Design a protein around this ligand. Structure first.
Ligand SMILES: CC[C@H](N)C(=O)N[C@@H]1C(=O)N2[C@@H](CC[C@@H]1CO)CC[C@H]2C(=O)NC(c1ccccc1)c1ccccc1
Ligand SMILES: [Zn+2]
Length: 99
């Protein structure tokens, strides 16, 4: 049920990062199901349509995917039920832990 059948394959996705000036890894992004829109560092997940932008140095493409778009069927089969929930518990723990 992918929102962009043309961007379904990895090859088509890194193809979009031919002018990537940002330090977030292009191969990592492509593998997480993202491609670029030539509009700042904005990226769209090929399958869920989920859009991410303003990446920070410490930010894992997979982790960011699960943080904002956990419904994603592509994410689920790549990384798993437990992975997705874990990322959410981690943010739940941190906020609780920080006084
Ligand atoms: C990707 C890691 C980054 N540090 C981050 O968390 N970005 C957030 C984000 O992309 N979104 C979350 C909140 C804003 C954050 C930026 O401070 C909610 C969902 C997501 C989003 O939809 N971003 C938008 C967008 C567009 C313009 C300005 C701000 C956010 C978006 C929409 C379409 C395509 C790309 C990004
Ligand atoms: Zn997705």
């Amino acid at each position: 049920l992918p929102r962009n059948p043309s961007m379904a394959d990895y090859e088509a996705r890194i193809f979009t990062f031919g002018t990537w000036i940002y330090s977030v890894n292009k191969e990592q992004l492509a593998r997480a199901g993202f491609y670029a829109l030539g509009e700042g560092d904005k990226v769209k997940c090929f399958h869920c349509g989920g859009g991410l932008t303003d990446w920070k140095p410490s930010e894992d493409p997979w982790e960011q995917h699960a943080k904002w778009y956990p419904g994603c069927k592509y994410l689920l089969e790549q990384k798993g039920q437990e992975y997705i929930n874990n990322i959410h518990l981690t943010h739940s723990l941190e906020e609780c832990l920080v006084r």
